[PDB]
Amino acid sequence: LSSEALMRRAVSLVTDSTSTFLSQTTYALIEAITEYTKAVYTLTSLYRQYTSLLGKMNSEEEDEVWQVIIGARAEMTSKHQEYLKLETTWMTAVGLSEMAAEAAYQTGADQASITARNHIQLVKLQVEEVHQLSRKAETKLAEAQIEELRQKTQEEGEERAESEQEA
Amino acid sequence: SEALMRRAVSLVTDSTSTFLSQTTYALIEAITEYTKAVYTLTSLYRQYTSLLGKMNSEEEDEVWQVIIGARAEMTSKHQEYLKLETTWMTAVGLSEMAAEAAYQTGADQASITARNHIQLVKLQVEEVHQLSRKAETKLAEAQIEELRQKTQEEGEERAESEQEAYLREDLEH
Numbered sequence: 001l002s003s004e005a006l007m008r009r010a011v012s013l014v015t016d017s018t019s020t021f022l023s024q025t026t027y028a029l030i031e032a033i034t035e036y037t038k039a040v041y042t043l044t045s046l047y048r049q050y051t052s053l054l055g056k057m058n059s060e061e062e063d064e065v066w067q068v069i070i071g072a073r074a075e076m077t078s079k080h081q082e083y084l085k086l087e088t089t090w091m092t093a094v095g096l097s098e099m100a101a102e103a104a105y106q107t108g109a110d111q112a113s114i115t116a117r118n119h120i121q122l123v124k125l126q127v128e129e130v131h132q133l134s135r136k137a138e139t140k141l142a143e144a145q146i147e148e149l150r151q152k153t154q155e156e157g158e159e160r161a162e163s164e165q166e167a
Numbered sequence: 168s169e170a171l172m173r174r175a176v177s178l179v180t181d182s183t184s185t186f187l188s189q190t191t192y193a194l195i196e197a198i199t200e201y202t203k204a205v206y207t208l209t210s211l212y213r214q215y216t217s218l219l220g221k222m223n224s225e226e227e228d229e230v231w232q233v234i235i236g237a238r239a240e241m242t243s244k245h246q247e248y249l250k251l252e253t254t255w256m257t258a259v260g261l262s263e264m265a266a267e268a269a270y271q272t273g274a275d276q277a278s279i280t281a282r283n284h285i286q287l288v289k290l291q292v293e294e295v296h297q298l299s300r301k302a303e304t305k306l307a308e309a310q311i312e313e314l315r316q317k318t319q320e321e322g323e324e325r326a327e328s329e330q331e332a333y334l335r336e337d338l339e340h
Contacts, residue, residue, distance in 0.1 A: 003193050007254075009188040014261065017178040021268065024175050028168075089172075092268045096179065099261045103186065106254040 007074035007107050011100075015112040018093070018100040019119055025086065026123040027095040032083035039076040040137040046072050047070045051151050089126070095118055172272050176265075180277040183258070183265040190251070190258040191288045197248035198295050204241040205302040212309040219320045224282050255292065258284060260296055 001009070046069050053065065097120050104112035211234050218230065263283050269278035 003189075003196070004188050005194060007186075010182070010189045013182040014179075014186045017182040021172070021175040021179050024172050028172070035288065089268070089271045092264065092271055096261065096268060099257060099264055103254070103261060106257055130270045159334045 004107075008109055011104050011107045012112055013038050015023075015097075015100045015104050015109070015116050018097045019116060020088075022093045022097045022119060022123060025090040026126060029083065029090045029127060030130050032079070032086045033127075033134055036076065036079035036083050037134045037137045039072070039079045040134070040141050043069070043072045043076050044141040044144045046135065047148050048139070049050045051144070051148045054148075056150055056153050094124070169272070171272055176269050176272050176274050177277055180262075180265045180269055180274070180281050183261045184281065187258045187262045187284065187288060190255045191292060194248070194251040194255040194292060195295050197244070197251045198292075198299050201241070201244040201248045202299045202302045204237070204244040205299065205306050208234065208237045208241050209302070209306045209309045212306070212313045216309070216313045216316050219316055254271070259289070 008087055046065075050065050053062075057065065101113045101116035101120070104110075104116060111125065211230075215230050215234065218227075222230065245337035266278045266285070269275070269281065273313050
């Protein structure tokens, strides 16, 4: 084959292989953000349960619920860290596919170039959507934590006031 | 799975290596064709110098026409090598980012391999580049020599033609 045919053959393999790597890393990242989002919802549920139990637990039971919350936080943290690692690799996969698209363009393989660029846009949209879902969960967690603190503050103020008047 | 990702990374490093190889060959060949076209123009200028004082205006105009042709060719080879130089730059960057993907996914052997390949091809291209730069310097040398000697020959002809104008006038008292 001619030099230009050899360059086109080679760039086609580069675009196919970087497309595959981008798809795999996108799938893994989306799965990891999903698992983190589930852990955020679990913790949010725990804060809400804990809030509903305030005033209603002996000191040992309260300590035990708090330990479960500490454990649920560890799980959420570990899932967050795992997705951040995968997201780092995914960013490299996106840059590789961008460079592959430029190589395809420069060699005159325009269909490979445009298809790669469409693929990068699609996976960015997909990752943005899963991030939006995660932020919805994080908002609910923040709300739950704020309500717990607001209630705990009221509880401690009530218990002070009781202790004083009792005395 | 990390299994599927290391397989795909291995295909990325292999394919980017193949593209880097092929673009390196294409660029070396293009720099070579340009250097040959520079060498041709240099030889033509040198020949023009060697012919000063031995040509009439008709022959000299033909020499210059051939030089203009050779210069057009050199320019076309220049454009083509800069086009391949851009493609090669992109190949090098692809391989660097492949080496980074490999490192991040635990494919440490593939990462080192890619970096060594980049260094080898960079060395080779740099050397072929240096050859072209030397050729360019030789062309500039030959053009300076030719224009200096052309200016001198013009002086010589003007001296002769003035002298012979007097000598004719002298005869027709």
